[PDB]
């Protein structure tokens, strides 16, 4: 009866709108108020997941429907299931930790924390939206906060990166809007935008293919798909590391979530048509990004291309029409949200001390900064698909989903299985080299770098608190999969003969 999801969506942006009533200077009160709001919201989502979400239910849960515009038949409609609660919890966790890690920011702290809370609200509103136009609105609601965060707290090339990001996202999202208009106006009697009634809609093959292309262009601009990935390297490389958490851990997974929710669920026939061509694209994306990563002298650009490489396993699990492949895609979503954010955070904190960019001049950092060396090595191992971490089990489950797939027969099933395997040969080749060019060797450092130079309690806590779920999922993957084994099956139930 109580509007839980509406309260969860509204609370961060509504609380951040009141951050301008504070007449205090500095950043202390602003950052403590922002972390209070973030932790209260996190506890609210924890209560919702604990007491009102049932992982055994394949249906929509905690639905809320309020008619907002009559002409479009447009409703503020919210609802969660096994697909959305994982991204919602990840969004809350990563956004709270990014607010905590953005504490040295003393320039325009009020606007920074307001934009962080706005990003919180927009991501949560996207992940819990059951209306197509509401989905599009929540998709669009992050162009301005990320643009401002990039252009006001980014790197050397922040302005060009922000312009490229906003223009690329608008270019994808106009195709998203065209797909929304096409799907929502297909009704013979009246327009409809609810996903529940749209999941039973029947389209001709050509119109379904056109709608799939219209949605897929947007979901390939957002989730990096070759060759619509060029915004990502300069956007993530020249962004603040706290913003890089949201960019590489949350915003990248939104394209995959839209692919499951819309392309995979609403339009199954066009998805079955397009998936074998998506498999080759994902494998070539893995190889292409894992080969582009050694060519990048910049550390953050290398990490961004690593993120592009890791998105290929999600693409494969999407295109492999099995329950196991979709479960592996969700597991890789969670694993990458836990790995890329921490890697970007460590890179930013290390740059705040070393103040160097290109890898060929950052030797010997392990001598003054051993703890950040340890965390960087551990998160590289997590990136390396090492067992005991979530990445290995995610890639293994994706491999199993391909092997167990019934759509493909033998030879492609070989040539793709070999394919990503080449990727996990290329993934060490730069990553360890990165460490070898960033921590190994001897350099004579200043005496002032002997003390008060390593990561403090806050950075250690952030890295540990993102590292622990990685180990917890790599040991017991069903800490995540059990939330979405049922709903994924329902998503697969439309892909078989009926």
């Amino acid at each position: 009866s109580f509007p839980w999801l509406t309260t969860i969506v509204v609370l961060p942006i509504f609380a951040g709108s009141l951050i301008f009533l504070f007449p205090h200077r500095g950043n202390k009160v602003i950052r403590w108020y922002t972390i209070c709001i973030s932790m209260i919201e996190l506890l609210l989502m924890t209560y919702v997941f604990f007491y009102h979400f049932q992982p055994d239910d394949p249906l929509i849960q905690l639905v809320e429907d309020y008619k907002w515009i009559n002409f479009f038949d447009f409703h503020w409609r919210l609802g969660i299931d096994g697909l959305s609660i994982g991204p919602i919890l990840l969004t809350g966790f990563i956004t709270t930790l990014a607010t905590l890690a953005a504490w040295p920011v003393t320039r325009n702290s009020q606007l920074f924390h307001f934009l962080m809370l706005a990003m919180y609200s927009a991501q949560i509103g996207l992940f819990s939206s059951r209306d197509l136009l509401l989905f599009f609105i929540m998709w669009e609601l992050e162009l301005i906060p990320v643009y401002l965060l990039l252009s006001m707290w980014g790197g050397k090339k922040r302005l060009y990166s922000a312009t490229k990001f906003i223009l690329y996202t608008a270019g994808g999202s106009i195709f998203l809007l065209m797909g929304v208009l096409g799907v929502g106006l297909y009704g013979s009697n009246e327009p409809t935008l609810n996903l529940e009634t749209l999941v039973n809609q029947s389209y001709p093959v050509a119109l379904e293919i056109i709608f799939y292309i219209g949605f897929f262009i947007a979901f390939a601009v957002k989730l990096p798909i070759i060759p619509l990935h060029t915004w990502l390297p300069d956007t993530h490389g020249e962004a603040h590391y706290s913003t890089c958490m949201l960019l590489a851990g949350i915003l990248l997974k939104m394209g995959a979530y839209g692919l499951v929710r819309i392309n995979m669920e609403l339009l199954p026939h066009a998805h079955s048509i397009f998936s074998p061509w998506l498999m080759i694209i994902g494998t070539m994306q893995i190889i292409y990004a894992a080969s582009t990563s050694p060519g990048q002298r910049n550390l953050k650009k290398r990490i961004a291309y690593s993120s592009v490489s890791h998105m290929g396993f999600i693409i494969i699990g999407i295109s492999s029409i099995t329950d196991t492949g979709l479960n592996g895609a969700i597991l890789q979503i969670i694993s990458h949200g836990f790995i890329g954010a921490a890697l970007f955070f460590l890179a930013g904190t290390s740059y705040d001390r070393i103040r160097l960019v290109y890898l060929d001049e950052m030797g010997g950092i392990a001598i003054p900064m051993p703890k950040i060396f340890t965390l960087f090595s551990s998160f590289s191992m997590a990136s390396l698909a090492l067992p005991g971490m979530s990445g290995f089990i995610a890639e293994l489950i994706v491999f199993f989903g391909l092997i167990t797939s019934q759509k493909y027969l033998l030879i492609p099933k070989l040539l793709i299985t070999f394919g990503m395997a080449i990727g996990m040969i290329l993934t060490p080749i730069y990553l360890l080299s990165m460490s070898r060019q960033m921590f190994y060797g001897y350099k004579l450092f200043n005496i002032s770098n002997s003390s008060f130079f390593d990561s403090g309690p806050r950075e250690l806590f952030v890295s540990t608190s993102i590292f622990l779920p990685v180990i917890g999922i790599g040991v017991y993957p069903d800490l995540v999969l059990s939330l979405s084994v049922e709903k994924v099956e329902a998503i697969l139930s439309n892909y078989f003969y009926r």
């Binding site: 302005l159 060009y160 300069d234």
Partner: protein
Amino acid sequence: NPWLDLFYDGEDEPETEYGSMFSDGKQDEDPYPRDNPENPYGFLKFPQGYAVEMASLGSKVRGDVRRCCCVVSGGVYDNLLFFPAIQLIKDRYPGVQIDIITSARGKQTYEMNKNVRWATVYDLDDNFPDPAEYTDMLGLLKNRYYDMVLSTKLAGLGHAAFLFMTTARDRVSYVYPNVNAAGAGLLLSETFTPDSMNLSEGGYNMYHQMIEWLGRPVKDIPQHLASPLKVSISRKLKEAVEAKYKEAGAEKGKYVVIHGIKCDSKASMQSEGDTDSLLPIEIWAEISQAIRGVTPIFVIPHEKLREDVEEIVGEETSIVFITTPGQLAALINDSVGVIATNTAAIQLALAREKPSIALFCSEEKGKCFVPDAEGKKCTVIASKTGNLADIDVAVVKDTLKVF
């Protein structure tokens, strides 16, 4: 040409007045808009009748510039020789902010310049730049909102288009004398055709056409000329080079600066119009053997040459490693004389009014590069065969008593 500007109707009539305000004078003379402390809302004091927005009127009527972009091609020598043009821009347009685009080596020249706001590094010699870097530089130039842009680089169609997309009111450039610069003048407000495919082939007055265009008398403003080359050295450069030459053993006001030792280093500060401006270390040792009472300091642009000097002139000599032109100018400032081949050292000696000896490969290069050597305390010793290694050490030994 009639087909481009249709409805031309000639030039302006002699009796046109262009209004009253923002009509004559310079940028620092405008009396309106002025502060209004008696206004309760903070609005300024505006003249009767005139619209509130008046700062845009000076650009249209008087042609005022407030931000200028000089895209200077070349290394240290060309960017150093562009200093009188920058001073001319500052004098003609009071309150202007001048930004420089140049190479990595030429950006260090503007350390000793008091007029440049921003100095930016951009690979101008690359005809096929990175699309991201090119777009970022173009957007940066667009966002600086330059009133006028000047280009010493010989501009084809591509460079003309790059200057065109800068949104500058005046686009002025040097163009290629060949047929490959066709259509470049359409996209540029003003075009200059040099006498050769290399602009650095001209000497100290290589930018003479740009100087004439900058100081032309327009609308009761008198003609502005180019000042002699000057540099300003900060205290940090002085302290650094003082430590550098105190490690070499020399002291203040008791040493001379020798420049132009032959090597493959790119920090030799040569000119593109004089590729022969290098002398071998043996001839330098022969010349420096004749110095008495003043400690000769050899300036090497690379440390790998140092040991070579230590086995040519002697192990007990004074060697100073200089790569940044500010440090070279600061070394020249504390010296008493400069024995230099045709590098930037002789120009910095001219800037600091030090008596100096210039060794040139030819007499024509000597008169073109330093046209007033006799007035500015310099003797030009030019080789009579056109080859610098064929210079005669006897004349230099005789002339070395000026210190």
